[PDB]
Design a protein around this ligand. Structure first.
Ligand code: DZ4
Ligand code: MG
Ligand code: MG
Length: 430
DNA sequence: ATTTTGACGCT
């Protein structure tokens, strides 16, 4: 009752760019705009692997991971943009730079946590309070929320058969219900949050050309879930009160961190399917099956409560370069391994030097990882060494030194290598 | 022959 926390202390948003790499390429090449389009890496093997897909192309069934030749079978007029290739490998520089454009705009509004190349969490609690002070008891107009969905609404009793009609009906129900004169109301706080996110999304689109979606809720997991509910080019507010119905038919795997083995174990061990069913277990029961930390997290999360903070971190903490060498292309000679380590080290040097100039920091550890043919794990082996100079020849030599004894017998390398990976870590200020 | 990443947990 009066002491049961409800996880309504924060306003958190998650902003995720729509078909991000595709929009970067469509901005660059107007011929690709408003077309079924995908971004592909490499080309020789089955036309290249698709890594991003426009919504027009998704309507034909094109998905990430599809070979371009196969996507063309579903969508004969599919247009393609290729990732830059440098030193024999895919180069993602253009997308990292476009990401910085977006993150720098978002950081004008609030502290952000860069969660991936095209998404960031925003802690809006302070900004909402300031905005509530600015507009004392002044009602919030639907005009301030032109792209917002209120999850769960409309409810109860032709304008109801088009999606914009439904969107506005739900928004009207929500705003009609609001208590505008209490500045401590969580639902009001979320609504002001959504007004700010509309402003943020408009700024991103104005200043970059890129569209995005967003979720606004009281924590990162609900914000992330909300964001996906009405992609693309829309934002969704998930209130605390919307959680029971939302979670009552929500597959466990849809919640952040439960899409893999742990989520599968929750389903198998407890014999449930939906996130809401978790409420019927005690905290101790969940801790007994999934550990103290996971158990406590699940117990709170199924009630819509999560405390993971929006970390103040706009820049990646590691800078890595990797290449797979699948099937017959697996690396089988010492010279091959050394040449590709050099290629990777040269890209890494270029990125590290730019990073040192832009961000006043230096990496101090080099992690070298390899995969051997047959091992299904991403990494078969990981070894580190000191990273003392931004020099590609030195980094490649040091990586070879730290992995060379993985070679059962050689001039020859065995078993063949299916992946090389260099990652610069442990940054210190410079 | 899905590729190239990046954050974080466990021991
Ligand atoms: N498995 C993968 N391998 C490589 N790159 C990938 C990837 N998954 C995504 N990317 C790259 C390419 C993606 O453009 C970018 C962002 O990933 P999303 O936010 O998950 N997907 P997007 O923004 O395209 O569409 P949506 O509107 O549904 O958000 O990261
Ligand atoms: Mg995206
Ligand atoms: Mg994303």
């Amino acid at each position: 009752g009066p002491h049961m926390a409800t996880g309504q202390d924060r306003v958190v948003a998650l902003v995720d760019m729509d078909c991000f790499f595709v929009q970067v390429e469509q901005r660059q090449n107007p011929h690709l705009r408003n077309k079924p389009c995908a971004v592909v890496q490499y080309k020789s093997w089955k036309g290249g692997g698709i890594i991003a897909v426009s919504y027009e192309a998704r309507a034909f069934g094109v998905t990430r991971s599809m070979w371009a030749d196969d996507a063309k079978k579903l969508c004969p007029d599919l247009l393609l943009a290729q990732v830059r290739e440098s030193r024999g490998k895919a180069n993602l520089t253009k997308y990292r730079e476009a990401s910085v454009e977006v993150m720098e705009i978002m950081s004008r509004f609030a502290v952000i946590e860069r969660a991936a190349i095209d998404e960031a969490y925003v802690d809006l609690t302070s900004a909402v309070q300031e905005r509530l002070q600015k507009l004392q008891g002044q009602p919030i107009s639907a005009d301030l929320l032109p792209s917002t969905y209120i999850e769960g609404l409309p409810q109860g009793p032709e304008e109801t058969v088009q999606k914009e009609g439904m969107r506005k009906q739900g928004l009207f129900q929500w705003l009609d219900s609001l208590q505008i004169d209490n500045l401590t109301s969580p639902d009001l706080q979320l609504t002001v949050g959504a007004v700010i996110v509309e402003e943020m999304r408009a700024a991103i689109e104005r200043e970059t050309g890129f569209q995005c979606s967003a979720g606004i809720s009281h924590n990162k997991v609900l914000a992330k879930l909300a964001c996906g509910l009405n992609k693309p080019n829309r934002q969704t507010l998930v209130s605390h009160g919307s959680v029971p119905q939302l979670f009552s038919q929500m597959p466990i795997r849809k919640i952040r961190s439960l899409g893999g083995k742990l989520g599968a174990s929750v389903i198998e061990i407890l014999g449930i399917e939906y996130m809401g069913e978790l409420t019927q277990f005690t905290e101790s029961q969940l801790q007994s099956h999934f550990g103290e930390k996971n158990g406590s997290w699940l117990y709170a999360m199924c009630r819509g409560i999560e405390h993971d903070p929006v970390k103040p971190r706009q820049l990646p903490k590691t800078i890595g370069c990797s290449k797979n060498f699948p099937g017959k292309t697996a690396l089988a000679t010492r010279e091959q391994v050394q040449w590709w380590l050099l290629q990777l080290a040269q890209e890494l040097e270029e990125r590290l030097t730019k990073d040192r100039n832009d961000n006043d920091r230096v990496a101090t550890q080099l992690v070298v990882s390899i995969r051997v043919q047959g091992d299904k794990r991403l990494s078969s082996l990981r070894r580190c060494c000191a990273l003392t100079r931004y020099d590609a020849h030195k980094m490649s030599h040091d990586a070879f030194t730290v992995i060379k004894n993985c070679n059962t017998s050689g001039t020859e390398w065995s078993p063949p290598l299916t992946m090389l990976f260099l990652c610069a870590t442990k940054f210190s200020a410079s």
